[PDB]
Amino acid sequence: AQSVDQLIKARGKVYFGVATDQNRLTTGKNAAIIQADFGMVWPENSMQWDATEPSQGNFNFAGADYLVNWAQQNGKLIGAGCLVWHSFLPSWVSSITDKNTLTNVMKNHITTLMTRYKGKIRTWDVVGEAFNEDGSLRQTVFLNVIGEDYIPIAFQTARAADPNAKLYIMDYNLDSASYPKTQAIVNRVKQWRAAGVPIDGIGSQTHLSAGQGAGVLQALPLLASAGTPEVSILMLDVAGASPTDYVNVVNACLNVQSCVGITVMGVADPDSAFASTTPLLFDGNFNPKPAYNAIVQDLQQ
Amino acid sequence: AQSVDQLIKARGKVYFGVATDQNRLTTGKNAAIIQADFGMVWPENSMQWDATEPSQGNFNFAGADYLVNWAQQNGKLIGAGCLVWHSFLPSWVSSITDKNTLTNVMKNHITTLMTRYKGKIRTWDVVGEAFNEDGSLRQTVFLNVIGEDYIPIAFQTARAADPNAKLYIMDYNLDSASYPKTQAIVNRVKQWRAAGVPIDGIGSQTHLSAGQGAGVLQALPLLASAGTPEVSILMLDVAGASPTDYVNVVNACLNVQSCVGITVMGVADPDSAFASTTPLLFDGNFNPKPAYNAIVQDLQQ
Ligand SMILES: O=[N+]([O-])c1ccc2nn[nH]c2c1
Ligand SMILES: O=[N+]([O-])c1ccc2nn[nH]c2c1
């Protein structure tokens, strides 16, 4: 099976990547497929807040360390995240009500994780899912306690911790150009960057239903109009794994100059959180599915 | 699918169990299958030394806590391990050369883990893979630095930390009654128990090639002749997943009064470390394989 990462690099992009973690790399055929076919790895779960700081100051890095070392040994780029994401917060964080304390807790979490891997991580997802569907800011503990400046603070802190990393904000339901959330994140990122906030990229969490790939062809250029140096496609999977949907997403990447690459959410269908929708590029026997071969043919042209 | 755990309990045994961990419970159909069909869970990796104490005295319990909570919420028994196993040691341990220091480090590791989960764990695998294939003791850091007393110390320390748990020694290649390692572990366990060492069980790590199930019918009664209150089948998988091999292992369990149950290495073939041998009871689409149905029929007859 030809390598989608090699082929996308030949078209001028940076990577075709995949999310993984230690117990994937030691089972199935995941390591062999990643070695041959993908150019970047992300930790699925091992870098999230609940996995890395389950109680205050008690950092759990064993799983993340394994993935970083494996990637370095095998010549792969590393992306990591998410530093600030309400969905993976442990209870001790969401109980904090003092603005000074929560600011320092957020800063220490960012600084500790980024310093540990300083210079080794290409892309950090710093803030995730900060927007409501109507485009207002999501009322998470960080917004409620710190206020809207928590986003500037997070990015400023991350830039100081590792100036080499590309810093991204990420969100989902940015797959349609007419959806209010898509326009809102563009407007807010434009404003933040105009005031000097170091947001290098917007990452679109592309968890799609059948037939939604076509809309990404119009949504991704819109996200790119915010003026960040980079945009990316993250967490990609498609219910039913139709070649048409997957090829449309790949072509959206190719059409947007600032889109650096694509990361799929897993290797093989049985290891998806959405396994009954068989939404990935390899089947339960680790054979490439028609969508994989269709991407290969699209990138060869 | 009828539950092998309910059927084996109806035959007078304690459980039919499976190894798992957090990211299995959140993907595929693993949680649903475990809820319906298995009565005990073990952490595959999250309790091993390299996952729980990656630096001296500094413990990581996020993954293990998740599995213990999940098991309690779903009414499942819990087994855990391995407290002392050379294959999962961090480098900081294997570089210790002082007998008193290594003894204290080992005792602290045992006591900290077992205290955290005191009263919640049915079975602890305390020492693993302590024997060479010829029956002599494996020359790990523990044997080289502490000496052969490390095994009595480990069990004595474990009994004091949680007197409710059943304490096991485990090894592999105990599948043939005429293999030297099988008789050696019997010899040594008899001696240790005569000296008052609290070894409650021998666990046989049953990682089998095709056709090796039949030999377990003679090996397991031999293991039971050491006189421990319990024996168990652990880490069970069979290359090719022949019904004949799986049924022979199940019947060995039924034939040995002190054998309390069986634990299979995982749920579905693609998540095995030996996936190309398709050695588990569910396939890559999470359908029960012929071996599963054969076990069901064997337990009903
Ligand atoms: O692209 N990704 O698959 C991915 C997975 C988990 C993440 N956490 N933060 N960013 C992430 C990206
Ligand atoms: O039975 N088991 O699958 C199993 C898995 C991992 C272990 N670590 N210690 N004991 C273990 C048993």
Swiss-Prot record, chains A, B:
Pfam family, one: Glyco_hydro_10
Highest taxon listed in the record's lineage: Eukaryota
Class in the EC hierarchy, top level: hydrolase
Disulphide connectivity of cysteines: C253-C259
Catalyzed reactions per annotation: Endohydrolysis of (1->4)-beta-D-xylosidic linkages in xylans
Signal among keywords: yes
Active-site feature positions: E129, M235
Alphabetized PROSITE patterns for the sequence: GH10_1 (PS00591), GH10_2 (PS51760)
GO MF annotation: an example: endo-1,4-beta-xylanase activity
Gene3D superfamilies recorded: Glycosidases
The protein, known as: Endo-1,4-beta-xylanase
Gene source species: Thermoascus aurantiacus
